[PDB]
Amino acid sequence: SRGFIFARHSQSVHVPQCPANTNLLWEGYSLSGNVAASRAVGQDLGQSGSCMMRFTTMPYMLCDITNVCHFAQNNDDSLWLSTAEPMPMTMTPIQGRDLMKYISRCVVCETTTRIIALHSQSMSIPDCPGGWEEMWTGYSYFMSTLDNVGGVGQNLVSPGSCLEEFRAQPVIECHGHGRCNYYDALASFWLTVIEEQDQFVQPRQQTLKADFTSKISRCTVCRRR
Amino acid sequence: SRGFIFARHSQSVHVPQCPANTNLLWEGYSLSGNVAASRAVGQDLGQSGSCMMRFTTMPYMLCDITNVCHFAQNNDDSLWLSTAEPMPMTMTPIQGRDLMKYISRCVVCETTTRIIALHSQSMSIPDCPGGWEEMWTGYSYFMSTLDNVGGVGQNLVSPGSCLEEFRAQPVIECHGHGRCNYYDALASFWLTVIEEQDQFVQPRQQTLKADFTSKISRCTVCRRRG
Amino acid sequence: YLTGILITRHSQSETVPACSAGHTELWTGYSLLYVDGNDYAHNQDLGSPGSCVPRFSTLPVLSCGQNNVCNYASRNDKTFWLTTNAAIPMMPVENIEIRQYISRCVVCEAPANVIAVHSQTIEVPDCPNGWEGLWIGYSFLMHTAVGNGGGGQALQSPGSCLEDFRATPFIECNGAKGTCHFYETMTSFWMYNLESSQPFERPQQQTIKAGERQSHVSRCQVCMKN
Amino acid sequence: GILITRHSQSETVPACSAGHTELWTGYSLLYVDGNDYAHNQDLGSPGSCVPRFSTLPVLSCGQNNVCNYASRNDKTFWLTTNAAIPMMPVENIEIRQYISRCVVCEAPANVIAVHSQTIEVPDCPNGWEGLWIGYSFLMHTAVGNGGGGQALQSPGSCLEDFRATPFIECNGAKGTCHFYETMTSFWMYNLESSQPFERPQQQTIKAGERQSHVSRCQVCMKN
Amino acid sequence: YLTGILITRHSQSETVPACSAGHTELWTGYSLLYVDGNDYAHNQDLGSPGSCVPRFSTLPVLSCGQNNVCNYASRNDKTFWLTTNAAIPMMPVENIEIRQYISRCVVCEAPANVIAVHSQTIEVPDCPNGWEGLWIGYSFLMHTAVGNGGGGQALQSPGSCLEDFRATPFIECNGAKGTCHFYETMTSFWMYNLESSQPFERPQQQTIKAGERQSHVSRCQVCMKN
Amino acid sequence: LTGILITRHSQSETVPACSAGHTELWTGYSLLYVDGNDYAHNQDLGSPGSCVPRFSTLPVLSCGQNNVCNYASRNDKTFWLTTNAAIPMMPVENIEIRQYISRCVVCEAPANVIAVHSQTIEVPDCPNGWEGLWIGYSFLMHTAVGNGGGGQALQSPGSCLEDFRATPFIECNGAKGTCHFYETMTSFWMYNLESSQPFERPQQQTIKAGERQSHVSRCQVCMKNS
Ligand SMILES: [Ca+2]
Ligand SMILES: [Ca+2]
Ligand SMILES: [Cl-]
Ligand SMILES: [Cl-]
Ligand SMILES: [Cl-]
Ligand SMILES: [Cl-]
C-alpha cells in the first residue's frame, strides 16, 4: 500500500469514524489555522496538518534574533473548527475545560488511493465518476476571513473544502490568554447555487435568515478504486 | 478674529446647532472616511473635512497613469456617521432615498479661540479648565475598524473624539453600488472607565451591553473666552 | 493500478480545451484565479481542479456571519479570472459581453503524477529521465492586483506555467455589478531569464518594451511519468 | 503666528502671498514607506515641506543599540511635477525635474480649505478671502493598499494643478526615483448631474474631460 | 488676544515633566504612542494633548460591535507606550512593575503657536526669526512594531522632536494580560544626518553601532513665537 | 513506482543526497517566499517547488498592462532558508552569499511521504506500516517584517526541519543583490506541551540560550512500506 492519508472532521465533541477502505492512524482536534504577527496562515482541512493530537489555545511560540523565545507572552491567535454547541447567552469568551464543548474532533485515515472533492454549484449532491467510491457528502466551504489579518482558505479539490454540516460560524478563534470565542469579524464563505441560466446575469442581492440549503452548493468527497 | 473652525455632528437626521458664541458657516452630512484600494483613510470628526455639503455613497473617483478615470466602476467604499434609525428586520442593505434616515447631519462653526476635548476616563463629566467655556459633552470615541482595510481614528484632543451620543455602531458603510449597511466586521473603540486604583491592575474581562455606558469614558469639548 | 491523480489545463482562449493523451475528461469550466472576499484574496492554484469552475459568475460565493445570517451580493466583493486573447475594451464589459474575456479549462484524470520544470533560460527545459512532456509555455509565478489582491502558484504545479505569455493575463469582475474590466493596478510576475548571469551576480535594471518581453521570460515543460 | 504651507507642483520654489513672511523652503514630501509601513505627512502642514532632499532621509534603528542606513528596501514618496515621464528610473541629479518644491509662510489668521463637490469653485465663508483655487485631492495609492490621504479641511486636500499621477516613488537604498503603473490617485467627484441618494452613475472618463469631473476647492484665510 | 494653544511635553523618564515659564499646567499623565485594536494601529501624535492620558492601563479602550454588545479585555489587543530610561528586563514586567517603564507627560497652555524645526545634520537647527526656543532634541519620525503595528509623528509637531535619543523608545503592553515587554520587532525611525552628502547623492549603506549613533541622527528644536 | 517526489533541505552549504533507493531529479537552493509588489507568495518547503535550481536575488520579472516590463526597478525582495553560519554585521553581497543559502534536493519515492508532529519534547513514532526518514523540529510560521511572511502545512515535510535555528531564513534585496538578516525576523515553532493538561491556560514562558530547544515540539517525516 502507498498510504495516502486524509483528515475527517466531525464538527462535534465526539471523534468521527474513518470511511470505508481506510485505516485509522490517530485522532485529535480540528486545527483550522494560526494568526501570528497579524498574519493568518491556515491548515488544509483535508490534510493531516488540520488534525492535532493535543489541543491548546496557543500551540506555538515566537523566537527572535537575540536567541530568546516568548510563549504566550504577547497577543497571537489560533483557529479551530467549532462544534454546534451554543455559546452562553452571556456571550463572554469560553475558558477552562468548558472549551471541550466547542472544539471539533478529527481523525487521520490512510488509504491506497487518492481523495478528491467535487462541487455541484447547485442543490443536487453530485455523484462521483466511474471508478470512484463515495465516502461522505457535505457543503462547499471556500474560506473564512478575519479583520486586518487576512483569512484562511481551503482548496476546492481538497476534502477540507467539503464540510459535512453547514455552519454560519464554522471556525472559532483562540488567544494566548487561554480562551476562545466567536468574534463579529469572523466570516465564512461558501460556494453559492448557480443555475445554468444564471451564469452571466448580474447577481441579485439576497439576505438569508433561514432555509440555507437553497443557496448553498453541495459537495462530495471520493476515493479512487 | 483669527477664526478657528470646528465641526459638530447631531448623529440624527436633524441638523445640529452651533454652540454659544460661534457662527455657522455651512451644514452638511457627517463623513467619517473613505476606503479606496482596500485602504481606509479617515476624516477628523472635529474638522470641516468631516462635513460634506452633498451626500453620495461614492464621493470620489480613481485615476490611473493612462490618463483615464473610473467612477463607481470598481469596488470602493465610503464611511459616514449614522443615525439611531433601526435597520429593517430583513437586514438588507439600504438604498434609495431611505438613506436619508441613516446618514447623520453636521454643521461647521467658526469661533475666535481654539477648541479642545478633555476625557475623564470615568463616569464623571470633566470640567473645563480655567478660562474655558463648555460647549457640549459626550462619550470618548477613539476609532473604528473594518476587516482587512485597517480603520479610521480620532485624535483625543479634537472635538471629533467626543460624540454626544454613544453608539455601538456609529459608522455605516456605503458602496459604489449606491447602498449602505452595517457589516459584522465594523467595530467601534471607546475609552474605558479606569479608576485610579486600577491603573496597574490586570484588566478584568467584561462583556457589557449597549446601555451599560458605565464603562464608557465621558468627555467634554471646551472653547476659550478672554 | 490507478491511484487517482487529477490534472487541470487552462486554454487561455474562448474555446474549451481537450485532455491530452489517453486521459479521461472529468469536467470543463472557466478559469478562476482568486476570490477577493472581505478584502482578502484567496487563490485557487491554476494546476488544481479548484481553479476550474464549471458554472461562471462574477460572484460565485456568498458570505455568512453572526446570528446565522448569510448574504449574497450584499457588499463589495470581487473575483478575478484568467483572460483570453480578446482585445482590451474601453469600458467595463457587462453580463454576456464578459464571456469572450474568460478563459476555459478542463480537468482530467492521469495514471501517474504530473509536475512542472522550469529552466530559467530562453531554452525550453527537457523533462527528467523517464518523464514525458505534455505542453510548453512561459513560467508564471505570482500576480498582484488592486488592494490586497494577489497570489501565486507553486513551482511544482502545472499552474506555475501557462502556454501563452500575456502582460494582462487576468481580469477583475465587480461582484455585485456583474461587470469586468482591466485596471492599471494589475501586475504579472514571471520567472526571469538567468542565462546572462551567474548565480550570485547583482541583477541589472532593465526596461523591456513591446515585443521584447517574450525573450526575457523563462520557459518550462509540464511532465508526467509513463 | 499661524503657518501656511504651499507646494509649487513644479521645479520652481513658490513664494508667500502679500504680507506672509517666509520661514523656510524645501521639498514636497508625501509619505515614507519604512519597514512595509506608510507614514504620511499633511500636505497642508509644514511637516510635508522638508529642507534637505534625499531618496532615504531616515535612519532605521533597532533594539540592540545598532542602526542601519540604506540597509533594506524602504522607499520615499514626493510630490512630482508636470515633466515628461521617463522609461527607466531617474538617478543622481536629473531627478530634480520630478520633485516639487514648497515653502512655509506665516499668516495672521487661520487658513482652511473648502470644497464644492461641483465643477464650480466654492466661495469662501463670510469674513474669509481666498488664497488660491484648485482640485480636491483626497487619497493616493502606490502599490497594493500602500498610500494615504488628505484631510479635507487642510489646504493639502486642495492642489492647484491636477495630474492623475501627482507623486513619484524613490527607491532609497538604490537612490533611484521612478513612476509605476500601479500608482492611482483619488479625487472628489463632480456631483452636479447626480440625483440625491441615488446610486452613482458609473463613468469611464478619458483625456481632457477628466478635469470636468473633479471637485473644485479654494484655500481661504480670515480677516 | 489669547487664543488657547496647548503643548505636550514628554519627559521620557519616571518623573513628571514641568511646564515652561509662564505656562498654565492643565494636566499630567502617561505617554501613549498608539493602540492596536482589532489589529489596526491608531496613533496619537506625541505633540498633541491626546498622547498624554492621565490614567494608565494596558488596555484603556473597549470595543463595541453588532447586536448592541460591547467588550472590554475580551480579545487579543495590545497598547504601545513611550518608555523611560529604566533597564530593559529579560521578561515581561507585571502590573505595578510597569510604572517604572512608562514615560510621563504634561499638557500646558501657551500664548503663541508652537512648531518644530529639523536640521537633518549634527547641528541644532535655529528657530525662525522672531521665535523663541523651548527645548532641543533628536528628530523622531516614525516607528514599526509587531504585525500591522506602526505609526509616525508629524514633522512640524513637537512629537517629532524628543529630548533624549533612544534606540528603544516604546514598549508593548499585552492588553488583557496586563504585562508589558520589549520585542525585536520594534523599530524606531529618525531623520538622518545629511551633512556628508549632497541632496541628490545615492545613499551609501552604513551600519552604525554604539556611541556613534547619536552623530548620525538629525537634530531638532521646539520653538514658539514671541 | 508511482512518481511521488520528496524534497529535503540541508540547512547548510552542502547539497544533500537522497536516502536509500530514491532517485535524484534535481538539486538547488531553498526558496522560502517572494515579496513582489508588497505581496508575499510562499513555497511549500516540503514540496519540489521550494527547491529551485538557479539562485538569484530577483529571479522574477514585473510586467504591467501597457506592454512594458521592468526588471530590478523597484524594491521587491526574495527569501531563502539560511544555514547555521554566523550572522554578519552588514549585508553580504555577491559571492559571500553562498555561505548563507541552504541547499536542497528532490527525490522520487515509491510510496507517500508525510510529517507527523508530537507537540512534545519526544520524537513521534511513525504509524503502523510506516518507517521514519528523518527527525526534527516543528516549523510552523515565519515573518520578516510587519505581517509579511508565511507558514507551512503541518502534513508537508517542510513543517519538519532537522536543525532548529531561531532565524532560519535570510532576506535578499533583489535590485541591489544584497542579502542580510534583520531584527524584525521572527520564527514560529510548535510548543512543547509535556507539562500541560489538555484544556489548561497556557503557561507563559520566556526561554533563553540553549533551553529554547527544550521547548520546541519534535516531529518525524515518515514514509509507508508497500
Ligand atoms: Ca472592499
Ligand atoms: Ca490580533
Ligand atoms: Cl458583494
Ligand atoms: Cl533602505
Ligand atoms: Cl483584549
Ligand atoms: Cl525590483
Q: Which amino acid is it at E118?
A: H
Structural method: X-ray
Q: F165 with F155: CB under 8 angstroms?
A: no
β-strand pairing of B132-145 with B162-163: antiparallel
Q: Which of B206, C75, B188 is nearest to A145 (CA)?
A: C75
Contacting residues of E for D40, CB less than 8 Å apart: 152
Contacting residues of F for C216, CB less than 8 Å apart: 61, 69, 71
Q: E117 with D49: CB under 8 angstroms?
A: no
Q: E69 with B207: CB under 8 angstroms?
A: yes
Number of separate domains in chain A: 1
| A188/C63 touch (CB, cutoff 8 Å), yes or no | yes
- Residue A222 phi, psi (nearest 5): -145, 150
Sign for the CA dihedral angle at F184, F190, F193, F196 comes to positive
Q: Which amino acid is it at B221?
A: V
Q: D83 with E225: CB under 8 angstroms?
A: no
- Rounded to the nearest whole angstrom, what is the distance from the C-alpha of residue F20 to the centroid of ligand 2? 46
| D51/E120 touch (CB, cutoff 8 Å), yes or no | yes
Q: Which of C5, C10, C1, C4 is nearest to C169 (CA)?
A: C10
Which grid cell is F191?
A: 510548543
Which of C148, C184, C207 is opposite residue D88, by nearest beta carbon?
C207
Q: Is E136 exposed, middle or buried (0-12, 13-18, 19+ CB in 10 A)?
A: middle
Which grid cell is C103?
A: 478563459
| C148/D144 touch (CB, cutoff 8 Å), yes or no | yes
- In the numeric block, the cell 514633522 is attached to E155
Q: Which amino acid is it at E62?
A: L
Reported as type and span, the H/E element at residue D162 is none
Q: C139 with C218: CB under 8 angstroms?
A: yes
Interface partners of chain A (CB pairs < 8 Å, 3 or more) are B, C, E, F
Q: How far is CA C200 from the centre of its chain?
A: 30
The CA-to-CA distance between both ends of chain E, in Å, stands at: 13
DSSP SS3 for C6: strand
Q: Which amino acid is it at C98?
A: I
Which grid cell is B175?
A: 458602496
> CA distances (Å), F90 to each of B203, D67, D68, F97, F102, in order?
43, 11, 9, 12, 20
D19 contact partners, CB below 8 Å, separation of at least 6: none
Contacting residues of D for E194, CB less than 8 Å apart: 52, 54, 57
Q: E61 with E35: CB under 8 angstroms?
A: yes
Which resolution in angstroms does this entry have?
2.9
Q: How far is CA F202 from the centre of its chain?
A: 27
Reported as type and span, the H/E element at residue C3 is none
Reported as type and span, the H/E element at residue C211 is none
User: What is the signed CA dihedral for D183, D188, D194, D196, rounded to 10 degrees?
Assistant: 130
Q: How far is CA F82 from the centre of its chain?
A: 9
F169 contact partners, CB below 8 Å, separation of at least 6: F32, F79, F80, F81, F82, F142, F144, F185, F187
Which of C90, C150, C184 is opposite residue D181, by nearest beta carbon?
C184
Q: Which of B87, B108, B107, B89 is nearest to B172 (CA)?
A: B87
Which grid cell is D92?
A: 543622481
Q: Which of C161, C74, C68, C64 is nearest to C119 (CA)?
A: C161
Ligand nearest to the CA of B192: 5
- Rounded to the nearest whole angstrom, what is the distance from the C-alpha of residue C142 to the centroid of ligand 6? 14
Q: Is B134 exposed, middle or buried (0-12, 13-18, 19+ CB in 10 A)?
A: middle
DSSP SS3 for B96: helix
Cα–Cα distance measured from residue A26 to residue F103, given in angstroms and rounded to the nearest whole number? 33
Smallest CA–CA distance from C39 into chain D, residue: D145
Query: What region does E60 belong to: left with phi over 0, alpha with psi -120 to 50, or beta?
Result: alpha
Q: Which amino acid is it at A220?
A: T
DSSP SS3 for C217: strand
- In the numeric block, the cell 477664526 is attached to B3
Cα–Cα distance measured from residue A64 to residue F207, given in angstroms and rounded to the nearest whole number? 11
Greatest extent of chain A over all pairs of C-alpha atoms, in Å:
61
Which grid cell is D116?
A: 464644492
> CA distances (Å), D116 to each of B107, D129, D219, in order?
15, 16, 12
Which grid cell is A199?
A: 451564469
Q: Which of A120, A7, A21 is nearest to A53 (CA)?
A: A7
**What are the E-state strand segments in chain A?**
4-9, 23-36, 39-42, 51-52, 60-63, 68-71, 77-81, 94-95, 105-111, 115-119, 132-145, 151-153, 162-163, 171-175, 179-181, 187-191, 206-208, 218-224
Nearest Cα of chain B lies from the Cα of E183 at a distance, in angstroms, of 21
Mutate to test the interface with E, among F182, F184, F186 (most CBs of E within 10 A): F184
Which grid cell is F44?
A: 511549500
Q: How far is CA E211 from the centre of its chain?
A: 22
DSSP SS3 for B145: strand
- Residue C216 phi, psi (nearest 5): -100, 5
- Residue B4 phi, psi (nearest 5): -75, 135
Which of E38, E181, E183 is opposite residue A185, by nearest beta carbon?
E38
> CA distances (Å), C215 to each of C122, C133, F225, in order?
7, 22, 46
Looking at residue A21, the DSSP 8-state letter turns out to be: T
- Cβ count within 10 A of residue F35: 24
Which grid cell is C58?
A: 462574477
For A95, half-sphere exposure in the C-beta direction (CA atoms, 13 angstrom radius) is: 14
For F198, half-sphere exposure in the C-beta direction (CA atoms, 13 angstrom radius) is: 12
Contacting residues of E for B207, CB less than 8 Å apart: 69-72, 74
The CA-to-CA distance between both ends of chain C, in Å, stands at: 13
Interface partners of chain D (CB pairs < 8 Å, 3 or more) are B, C, E, F
β-strand pairing of E104-110 with E187-191: unpaired
Q: Which of A8, C144, E209, D197 is nearest to B178 (CA)?
A: D197
Looking at residue A130, the DSSP 8-state letter turns out to be: T
Which of F37, F73, F173 is opposite residue D173, by nearest beta carbon?
F173
Greatest extent of chain D over all pairs of C-alpha atoms, in Å:
60
- Cβ count within 10 A of residue B16: 21
Work out how many CB contacts closer than 8 A connect A with C: 161
Q: Which of F10, F83, D63 is nearest to F92 (CA)?
A: F83
Judge whether E47 is closer than 8 Å to chain A, CB to CB: no
Looking at residue E99, the DSSP 8-state letter turns out to be: G
Reported as type and span, the H/E element at residue E91 is none
Which grid cell is C209?
A: 518594451
Q: C69 with B181: CB under 8 angstroms?
A: no
Cα–Cα distance measured from residue F18 to residue C178, given in angstroms and rounded to the nearest whole number? 52
Query: What region does B21 belong to: left with phi over 0, alpha with psi -120 to 50, or beta?
Result: left
Cα–Cα distance measured from residue F199 to residue D223, given in angstroms and rounded to the nearest whole number? 69
Cα–Cα distance measured from residue F187 to residue F151, given in angstroms and rounded to the nearest whole number? 10
Which grid cell is F3?
A: 512518481
How many residues are given for chain E? 226
Looking at residue E1, the DSSP 8-state letter turns out to be: -
Which grid cell is B205?
A: 474581562
Cα–Cα distance measured from residue F143 to residue E225, given in angstroms and rounded to the nearest whole number? 47
Q: D161 with D134: CB under 8 angstroms?
A: yes
Q: Which of F2, A224, A113, F22 is nearest to C112 (CA)?
A: F2
Which grid cell is A98?
A: 468548558
- Cβ count within 10 A of residue E168: 17
- Residue F100 phi, psi (nearest 5): -125, 10
Q: Which amino acid is it at F179?
A: C
Cα–Cα distance measured from residue F31 to residue F33, given in angstroms and rounded to the nearest whole number? 6
**What are the E-state strand segments in A102-186?**
105-111, 115-119, 132-145, 151-153, 162-163, 171-175, 179-181
Q: Which of D154, C63, F53, A22 is nearest to B185 (CA)?
A: C63
Chain A residues 158-217 with CB within 8 Å of chain B: 184-187, 205, 207, 209
Q: Which amino acid is it at D197?
A: F
- In the numeric block, the cell 526596461 is attached to C207
Which grid cell is C116?
A: 512542472
Cα–Cα distance measured from residue B93 to residue D114, given in angstroms and rounded to the nearest whole number? 31
Q: D136 with D219: CB under 8 angstroms?
A: no
Q: How far is CA B114 from the centre of its chain?
A: 20
Smallest CA–CA distance from A186 into chain B, residue: B185
> CA distances (Å), E95 to each of B201, E53, E172, E175, E226, in order?
6, 18, 13, 11, 44
Cα–Cα distance measured from residue B163 to residue B10, given in angstroms and rounded to the nearest whole number? 9
Looking at residue A117, the DSSP 8-state letter turns out to be: E
Any idea what the Cα angle at residue B150 is, between residues B145 and B151, rounded to 5°?
40
Cα–Cα distance measured from residue D90 to residue E221, given in angstroms and rounded to the nearest whole number? 34
Judge whether D207 is closer than 8 Å to chain E, CB to CB: no
Contacting residues of F for A41, CB less than 8 Å apart: 141, 150-151
Which grid cell is F24?
A: 535524484
Reported as type and span, the H/E element at residue E149 is none
Contacting residues of D for B24, CB less than 8 Å apart: none
Reported as type and span, the H/E element at residue C127 is none
Please report the domains of chain E, with CATH numbers, ordered by start residue: 5-63+71-225 (2.170.240.10)
Any idea what the Cα angle at residue D192 is, between residues D186 and D198, rounded to 5°?
85
Cα–Cα distance measured from residue C3 to residue B175, given in angstroms and rounded to the nearest whole number? 49
Reported as type and span, the H/E element at residue B93 is none
Contacting residues of E for D95, CB less than 8 Å apart: 200
Judge whether D190 is closer than 8 Å to chain E, CB to CB: no
Q: Which of B161, B133, B157, B137 is nearest to B21 (CA)?
A: B133
Which grid cell is B37?
A: 484600494
Q: Which domain holds residue B118?
A: 4-203+211-224
Cα–Cα distance measured from residue D97 to residue D102, given in angstroms and rounded to the nearest whole number? 14
Nearest Cα of chain A lies from the Cα of E77 at a distance, in angstroms, of 7
Which grid cell is E196?
A: 556628508
Burial F64-98 (b: 16+ CB within 10 A, else e): bbeebbbbbbbbbbbbbbbbeeeeeeebbbeeebe
A197 contact partners, CB below 8 Å, separation of at least 6: none
In CATH, what number is assigned to the domain containing residue A119? 2.170.240.10
> CA distances (Å), C95 to each of A198, C184, D137, in order?
10, 22, 33
- Cβ count within 10 A of residue C111: 19
Ligand nearest to the CA of D173: 4
Cα–Cα distance measured from residue F79 to residue F57, given in angstroms and rounded to the nearest whole number? 8
Which of F153, F181, F199 is opposite residue A65, by nearest beta carbon?
F181
Q: Which of C26, C30, C27 is nearest to C14 (CA)?
A: C30
Nearest Cα of chain A lies from the Cα of B87 at a distance, in angstroms, of 13
Q: How far is CA C138 from the centre of its chain?
A: 12
% helix, strand, coil for chain C, step of 5: 10, 45, 50
- In the numeric block, the cell 504601545 is attached to E80
- Residue D195 phi, psi (nearest 5): -100, 140
Q: Is D12 exposed, middle or buried (0-12, 13-18, 19+ CB in 10 A)?
A: exposed
Cα–Cα distance measured from residue B108 to residue B92, given in angstroms and rounded to the nearest whole number? 33
Residues forming beta bridges with residue D222, ordered by sequence position: D128
Q: Which amino acid is it at B99?
A: L
Q: Which of A20, A21, A41, A24 is nearest to A32 (CA)?
A: A41
Interface partners of chain F (CB pairs < 8 Å, 3 or more) are A, C, D, E
Looking at residue C126, the DSSP 8-state letter turns out to be: P
β-strand pairing of B218-224 with B115-119: antiparallel
Interface partners of chain E (CB pairs < 8 Å, 3 or more) are A, B, C, D, F
Nearest Cα of chain A lies from the Cα of F51 at a distance, in angstroms, of 21
Which grid cell is B20?
A: 454659544
Q: F31 with F50: CB under 8 angstroms?
A: yes
Which grid cell is F63?
A: 510586467
- Residue C36 phi, psi (nearest 5): -105, 90
Sign for the CA dihedral angle at C59, C64, C65, C67 comes to positive
Any idea what the Cα angle at residue D97 is, between residues D91 and D101, rounded to 5°?
115
Query: What region does A22 belong to: left with phi over 0, alpha with psi -120 to 50, or beta?
Result: beta
Cα–Cα distance measured from residue D78 to residue C68, given in angstroms and rounded to the nearest whole number? 48
- Cβ count within 10 A of residue A130: 7
Sign for the CA dihedral angle at D45, D50, D54, D58 comes to negative
For E27, half-sphere exposure in the C-beta direction (CA atoms, 13 angstrom radius) is: 21
